[PDB]
């Protein structure tokens, strides 16, 4: 049965990641990475998650199954901070959220929901995107296809080119929107280009589908969703796919959510029924430790402002490396403007390195990224800084 | 997009557990759960898992991802449980194990690694199996067929019937064995029908797929895996999906296994690496923190024998159970020949009441069980064992 198989494509950031291991140089720096560390190069357990596990530790008396949904009072915290407190969709009860695992999952489950209950053929992502939203839609027999975005002149949105690029894309067909710090580029649409976004995408018919893992980390929790709010201000559908790994930093325990979001509450309450189904054929029901921390944070003002003094600390100093970076870069000697690292959002952002210059820089200097050029900036810290600007300089 | 979508079937369990929740009456007794009660009719923490907990607690730095396969000595420490330590599957290198969110989710990710990687079409599952099985293996593009199983006359293993049915199996199909404890009837192979069904399934080309959701509960670990390990001599290759949800009592936490066989390590390998794509496009990578806790209990000796007592325990209290409703449905004037009951493994049982008994228990005397008739003899205890044996032998 299995003799025939073709071994799947080596991945290739993983196989940065071994490389990593197995390099013996003392100086290496990885800016590989896609998740948080802190100015010791770690990525520790919050505080506040941990207060919450020795709650649960203590006061938790069964393990006996979630519903398939999860956590009553997870989904609830999840629509106050998509939607905000008092968002008519949630007195109007338009919306339905699934406890998954992780954001990936509520992403599996979204597809599967769109391919087997709607005649959704064809979901449009951002030239870039995060690679594995493509093997998930195909994974459930949807066709992704791409919209310009990036201006690499001036390190922008290019506005226009994502506009012309999506008058290709048809009434019903799925628009995925990253909710803020775009992955890889750091780049998002203002508060007015989401606007504008809101009517096209309404005009066109467009089914939104938001992927919202950095909440919190651009700006702030309430701002970094104003450009979802601005469609649901628009749109009777849309489809949310969040996360919380990054922002609780509970990346290993999968923790997400799926959001439904339809015209009124008959209609989204029976749509979410086959979503549920959908779940149901895949792991039945999500994994209790990780949205049990999360509900048991959200829903305690002492827990709550603990972790949201957490968040700001590594927002801040994901800003400060923006800084640091761009400052010593011109100190090394660089001379390129390297100033829109100063305006990108969150924990990424093109570098501008082209493929070779990012071979050259692992070979000869010991120094990580990824292929596309795209750095962490939560990788540097005060004192690796100035190995890697003399090096990046080294290859420019 | 959604205005038009059906809503999915109303699941009958589920409606179940509403009506037990509302029903009012005091005498009443759910046997129609799926998980193990105590004899508080609690589904506890093991204290096991406790112990575990508060070490993670008190010793994990991060929750940086798990790789796609999750925790490697998770991974050992089923493939010893699966195959048997000094077993010759284990020092040829021929199996691969993901850990997987549940039993549920090693089930999808083997369905979804068949339907895109092999020219499997078809599984086939017990007549009765559990329901699910095919709302997994459906939602990935397989069909399912049934095999015949239950003798209702004798309350056993109709193992002519079966034979005669998978006649008609064509080579390259599925074929679903429950590893111990079939749910719902409890009837299992004898360890030399397991050995016919074997090699008659290499003689057929039948790829095995193993369900082993309670190994632990029929006789005890090693004796439970006997099947799988008559067929694992005879056959290059087949899949175990197995759980961990029932014999460590931790059913929310999501945690379970796929186990990929193949004739040799780079074969098994080459196609494990098409199952890490399937994961990948899923849910990306899986939970930690109930998968640690089976780790930390396994390969702790300590922890690992305070466990096998607590499933020893519930392995007998079950036992007790079985012997206790005989014993009083006998002296309540039942009068049928009940000593199945005894024989049969794990937490269920036909009990052979029909559909409108099944509702006359529920409507009349507050006792639920599934419309099947299955039982969960677990929600049995000594206090509620007469009233219950009164109310069915009324039904009778």
């Known amino acids: 049965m299995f003799e025939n198989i073709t071994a799947a494509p080596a991945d290739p950031i993983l196989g940065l990641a071994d490389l990593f291991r197995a390099d013996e140089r003392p100086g290496k720096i990885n800016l590989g990475i896609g998740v948080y560390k802190d100015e010791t ?3 520790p357990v919050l505080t506040s998650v941990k207060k919450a596990e020795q709650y649960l530790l203590e006061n938790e008396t ?10 009553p009072e997870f989904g609830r915290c999840t629509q106050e901070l998509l939607f905000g407190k008092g968002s008519a969709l949630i007195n109007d009860k ?23 209950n709607t005649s959704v053929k064809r979901v449009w992502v951002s030239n870039p995107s995060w690679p594995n939203h493509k093997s998930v839609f195909n994974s459930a ?18 506005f226009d080119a994502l506009i012309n690029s999506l008058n290709e894309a048809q009434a019903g067909d799925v628009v995925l929107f990253h909710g803020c710090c775009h992955n890889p580029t750091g780049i998002d649409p203002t508060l007015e280009q989401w606007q504008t976004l809101a009517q096209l995408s309404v ?20 701002e970094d969703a104003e450009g979802l709010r601005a469609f649901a201000a628009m749109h009777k559908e849309l489809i949310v796919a969040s996360s919380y790994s990054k922002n609780f930093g509970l990346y290993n325990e999968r923790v997400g959510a799926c ?18 189904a959908a779940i149901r054929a895949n792991y039945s029901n999500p994994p209790a430790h990780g949205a049990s921390v999360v509900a048991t944070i959200l829903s305690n003002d002492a827990l709550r402002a603990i972790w949201e003094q957490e968040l700001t600390d590594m927002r801040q ?53 990824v292929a596309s050029g795209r750095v962490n900036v939560a990788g540097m810290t005060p004192d690796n800084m100035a190995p890697l600007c003399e090096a990046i300089v080294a290859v420019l």
């Open 41 to 43: 190069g770690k990525t």
């Open 62 to 71: 069964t393990k006996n199954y979630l519903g398939i949904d999860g956590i």
């Open 259 to 276: 959001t439904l979001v339809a015209a009124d509450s008959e209609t989204v309450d029976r749509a979410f029924s086959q979503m549920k």
């Open 141 to 158: 027999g949807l066709e992704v296809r791409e919209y310009a975005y990036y201006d690499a002149e001036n390190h922008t949105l290019d």
């Open 94 to 116: 338009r919306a339905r959220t699934a406890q998954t695992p992780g954001g990936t999952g509520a992403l599996r489950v979204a597809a599967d929901f769109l391919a087997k």
């Open 203 to 222: 005009e066109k018919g467009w089914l939104p589908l938001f992927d919202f893992a950095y909440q919190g980390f651009a700006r702030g929790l309430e």
């Open 317 to 369: 100093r994901i800003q400060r490396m923006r800084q640091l970076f761009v400052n010593t870069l011109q100190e090394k000697g660089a001379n390129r403007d390297f100033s829109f690292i100063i305006k990108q959002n969150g924990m990424f952002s093109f570098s501008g390195l082209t493929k070779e210059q990012v071979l050259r820089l692992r070979e000869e200097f010991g120094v990580y990224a």
